[model samples]
Structure formats: C-alpha cells, structure tokens
Target: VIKEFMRFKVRMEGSVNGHEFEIEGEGEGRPYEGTQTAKLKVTKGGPLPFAWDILSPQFSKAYVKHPADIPDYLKLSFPEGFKWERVMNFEDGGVVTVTQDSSLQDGEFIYKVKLRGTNFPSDGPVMQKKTMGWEASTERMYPGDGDGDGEAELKGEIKMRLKLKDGGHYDAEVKTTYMAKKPVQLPGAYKTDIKLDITSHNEDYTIVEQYERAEGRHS
Candidate 1:
C-alpha cells in the first residue's frame, strides 16, 4: 500500500458448459499496504476470437482467507453489498446468510446475492475466509502478438475445489500472458461435468516483465 505491490493475478482457465475456452489478461495495481491506488486488468479470448473481450468482468463477490490473498472462482457480472452472516457450517459443507446493505452506492443499491451455494472463505484455515467485491478490465496485447517487445497472454494450474449449496466440487486448471510468465502450481487437467461451471479469467498470463520493483516480482 505504500508505493509497492504484493500480488496481482486472475482466477484461471480451462472449460465450461460444453464450450472450449482459454483466458488471457493484463493488470497493474498497488500490491502493497495502504489505502490502495489499485486497479487490476484482464482480457480474454477462446469460446470466440480476438477482441472476444471480457475486458475485466464485473465481480460482485470474491473469496479469500485474508485481504492479502487474491480470490479464485469469481462470478462475473454478479451482485454486491450484502451482509453475509454464517447460517451453517459442517465438516464437509457450509453456508452464509445474505442481506442487502443500504449504506454503500448511496443506499440505492439494494440488490441481494443468491444462495447458489457457499461462497465465503471459498475454503478454510488455508486461506482464513474473507470477502470483498470488484469491477474489473482487460488491457493491451503481447509484444509477440505484435504489441511490442515482450507480451502475449495468460495464469495457472491447480486443483480448484468449489463449495456449493449442496457441497464442494473440484476441477483442474491452465495456461499464459504479457512478455512471459511462469506458473506457481500446475493445474491437474482442464475438464468439466454436470456439477461444475467454470468461467476463465487471467491477466499477466505471461510474466516476461514481472517488473523488477513491482509487487510479487517474478522474472
């Protein structure tokens, strides 16, 4: 928040609803400790073509163990400003109570989030369970895709376990973004099924210029 960054990223890729897709995006923001002059950016393709632009999908809710942890499985163009009180908890499943908050956006935004299932903490102790919302964007192309000197597009690979109204579900994750990038954890294998609904999102897919002084500076 001072004048540095800590982390910047997107949830990830793969497929959903019988559609084949790949995600790519770009983002820059203050990844450090402060009030934050932060802004994240992303761009996507696959399930379509170039300029098949998602340009930062609007996320109504995000899950994290702490404010420091980036979120996974963001529901784009969702709802916002609701009070989430715990309604249930189990060794295998959990639930949250939701209500509209009437103070933000001038008290005119009284929309409530749906009970699609459990979305808080997205997990547990590993992440400590936190919540927030965001409106996002997609920016620039790679140096090779003909943008300039280093760039292209894309984020990760991991066993994504999703907690739903009924229970928790899981899936494998994918592929790249600007200049060039490296994955922290490799995704299992990208696939889909009846119980899964995966929507892809990534920026800085390639980490060529992870910026020497930037947050979470990768080479």
Candidate 2:
C-alpha cells in the first residue's frame, strides 16, 4: 500500500542584538531582522528530520520580530510551489495543527509555537509548547556511547505543547535516545520543511528565489 505524507511550514519571528558589522558591498549595517523556516514532514507517524534553512543572514547583532513584521527578513524556499514526496510511513504520531508567533520587549525575545499530534508512539499523543532563549550551543549529540559504531551516544530532546484546531488539547515531549551509524536513506529524511500556509483558496503557490517583497535580489 502507498502511504500519503503531509508537509507543513512553521514560521518564526524574533530579533538579535545590534552591532556594527560589515558586508561585501554594504559597508556597515546595524540591528537587522531575523527569520527561521521549519518544514515539517509527517505521514501516519510523526515529524521526520525535515530540512531547515535560515532565510536571513547570520545576525551580528540586532532586534528581530515575526516575518509578518519584518517583511524583508522573512525567508521561504518554495515561494512558487511546495516540494513533496512519499515515504514509508511510521505509526508514531500524526500532526493536527501547526502555529507560529513571536514577540520582543526590552532586549529579550519571547516566541510561541503550538503543535498538535494524535496516535503517538507508546506514550500516547501530546501537545508541545517550547519557550526557549536562543544562544549558541555545541552539545551536538544526546546520551549513549561515543564510539563511531552504529551504536553511539547521541541524544536530544523536544519540548512542545499542542492544542487541536478541532477541539481539545494535550502535552507532548520527544527525547532522542540514540543515533545509528548507518545513514538514514529516505526522501522524507532529507526533505526540506518550509511549507507555507495557503493564503487564499484561489491563489497558485510557486517557488521563487527572492523574498516576497524584495525588488529583485535572489540569495
């Protein structure tokens, strides 16, 4: 049986500290905008390692907000059309709804995200809400052995909350227990997760290289 997959995009808006910085052509720019695109992949199970790309350049320092606020920083891969493919579906969890919103005050960033899932693995479906402060972290892997063997010490965790668009709500958490040496070979595994929300029922979706509002700059 061929299974169907659903992909969605989560938009993030926020800001960074501002400092004098130099670019190739532009001499100095201060306190710029920031945006992040999270593409989600799901079938019968839950989210895959959906690919992600930051639309804006690495911030030297500046305050940022939602893409809706800073039109220029909002980055999307498929501005014209969405890219989708099929894969072996897992029976872990299914996504119900995805939301993205953010706010900034006093030099601090407050971001809110909501994801709802149903029929999850052993622990039952859950809702996850994450309130994280952005800072660079180098702790790459999770718990386990550190040998390069297929069985190594790789670890991670996902803290999230969910509220169904249909009705009720639930809490969810995903903790990565291990990492295998063999590379995961699946279209869903390497697929990018930048699904944009369908704005209107009649509008056609397309992918373009430049920002939606940019005059003609493709990066």
Candidate 3:
C-alpha cells in the first residue's frame, strides 16, 4: 500500500581540499513508486589564456527551509516586487538568496539562487546504491556561487535514496533543479567530494497540501 504522508531530511554536501560545503533541508512529500533521476552536468572553459577560469564557490554549511519558516518581510512574492530573500545561514559568511518563483510544473518548486560557493566535482565516478533503489549519473556540478568563477550555469538533479518510517527504502522519485537556472558553459578545473543525503523520520498527509498551497500562492 502507498503511504499518504511522510517527513524527510535532505542534505547535499561537497568537500574540496578537505573543506566542506553543503545545503540541508527537510520536508514532507508524497512518496510515489517508480524511478527518480538526479542529473549533474559540468561545463569547462576553453584552455585559452583569455577564456574564463572556473573555480568552485566557497562556503561552510547551509540550510533550505519552507516559506512558513521564513520571515514575512522576506516572504513577498516576485510579482509584487523584489522577492529575493536570504534563506541559508552560511557560517563562514556566504549568503544564499532564493527568488520565490512558481514551480515549472505541478508538484515542483523552483528556487532561483543568487549566491556563491564551491560546486561538486565535474569529473567523477557515478554514485549509486542498488539496494537503496537510486542512481546518479556521471559528470556532476554542484550548486554554489559561480558568479565570480566564470559565466557558468549550475543546475541539475541530486537523486535521493529515501528511508521511510515504514522501514522501507524508496528513491525520492523526482528530479530537482536548484541554484543556477540557465544552462552552464562547459570546460573548467574544479575539485570536491560531494554527498547527497535524504532521511525520513515521520509521516503525515501534508505533502500534497503544502505543494498545492505553494503552487497556488506562487502562481
């Protein structure tokens, strides 16, 4: 039988030269059966001297939260005016700006970020676990501040393997796009040990309600 409500905690972490950069957020979502894909793409700059040199964004740690956890002053929609709000608490002093935009399709919320930090390594082995029912493709690019690195676009999915309260494991079957919106340019030198995690501890019926509420309000 399919469950109605569930709570999950997700954390996307990357490490470069032993330094760690990550984003963590937890929420309730309806668990659907099927496959989930998290796609990562990295574009490197030309090897010419004049070409832009792409370096990873630098940061410590971050958090992603729901609108209810956000302050009213920062919760205004984009239609009304400037809705760019500081969402993440970067301990090292980096700021995470998320523009409140409507989800591309139903059951999705797209957050446009204006921030800086390191990205997941562009060239690395594919990460997957057969027992958990999840798989991430090769060639990864993490979401961080690339405004200073080069004219780059950082967007893609980080497929999640979720462990539910029912003692059953489910791949959070939805592809997600975060941080940069436009397509990223290829060719760059970057390094980092990236990690994606999702944990569920509670169950509820609010996933659909919240998705619908946010979609309606944003639209």
Candidate 4:
C-alpha cells in the first residue's frame, strides 16, 4: 500500500486579524485530486474563520478564504494538462471561477490565468522556473469606484518553493501579500483600503508500505 501525508500551517492578517490554523491529513496511494478522498483533522491553532473542506490531503486541497480576495487557493501541483479550472467559494454567498493555462518556453514556466467574478481583476500571468521556486507581483485597476473617477488599484505579491519529485508540489515558505486602494465593492459592498498578508509552511511525504492481508481480514 502507498502512504501519503501532508501538513499545513496557515497564518493570516488584516480584516481577519491574527487568524491562524494548522491542518494535517493522510491518504492512501498517490495523492490525486479525488472527491473528498482525504481524511483531514485540525492539529493546531484553531478552526478556520471561514468555511473550507479537504478535497485531497496529498494534493494540498485544504483551504480557507482570505481577506485579500484571491480567487482560488494555490494548488500544490496542477493537474496534467495545458489548462485547468478551479472554483472558489467566498465566506458569503459568492463564487469565483478561474481558468489557468500553463506553458514551458525559453527555459521558463509561464502561467496564464483568467478569473470570472465580480470585482475580480484581470491578473497577469505568472512566470517562473520549471523547477525550484517562484516570486510574482501584479498590479491592476478595478472598476468599482463609487465616484466617477473609477480609479481603484489592487496590487499583490506571491512567493513559494516547489519540489518536482514524486509528484510535483509547493512544499515550503509560501507567502502572499495583497494591498488594495479603494478597490471595488466586494460581496459586503464595502469599499476601503485593505491590506493583508498570508504566510504558511507546507510539507508533503509519500511512501510505500506493505499491508498484511491477515490483519486486514481480522479487522
């Protein structure tokens, strides 16, 4: 039998304010994005302030909404394809749909993303090395101003470490910061200056172990 394990330490600041949580889980066999295949448990900190569910522990699918308004939680590894789709739920009654396309050219990895949701900005593509790590920054103007100026700016930065062995994954030092200047009105219809920082450390492990059928039959 194949054994897989993962742990996540999530930390956040800003509107949520000093909210942190740790979650760990285990799965059998190679970690794939299956439907509710991972058994999850809260191991540290506390339950998240927002609603969340673990789609797959080995795939790093446990995620909660952040105050920074990112469309979807980043994945440990994308599925095998040139493009993929992700759906994210808000604490409130909101949903964000995302489409991502990946490509490798000029010895670099490029990710193009498209988001479909109100108040969501047209974030630019992310470019990084095919192996190791990535650091990215993006700034865009959103049209959600109450006044006629309609000049709201949103800027953010993301950094993460990736390991491409035994199924690729981002396994360490994931951090992101988002700053919005009078951006569009979110689900709550509030428009104000917002700043948030999220940091976390992730670990993943996979191993093969023998299972005794005699013990299994007795159990």
TM-score of the candidate numbered 2? 0.22
How far out, in Å, is residue 130 in model 2?
A: 19
TM-score of model 1 (CA atoms): 0.20
Top model number, lDDT: 4
* Regions more than 4 Å wrong, model 1: 1-29, 33-155, 177-219
Question: Regarding lDDT, does 2 or 3 come out ahead?
Answer: 3
Q: In candidate 3, what are the lDDT values of residues 141-188, reduced to their tens digit?
A: 334443345443332232333333345443322222222233423222
TM-scores, each model vs. reference: 0.20, 0.22, 0.21, 0.21
Q: Give a tens-digit lDDT track for model 1, residues 1-219.
A: 112432223323322212233333222333232111113222233323211111111111112111223211111111222222112222334332222121123212222222222422334421232211111211211112222334322122112233333344322121111111222222122221111111333332221122111111111
Provide the global lDDT of candidate 2 against the true structure: 0.23
Please say which candidate is ahead in TM-score: 2 or 3: 2
Candidate 4 — what's its lDDT? Answer: 0.26
Pairs that collide, model 4: none
Local distance difference test scores for all models: 0.23, 0.23, 0.25, 0.26
Candidate 2 local lDDT, 126-170, one digit each (tens): 222111111122112223433344543333233323333345543
Candidate numbers, best lDDT first, in rank order: 4, 3, 1, 2
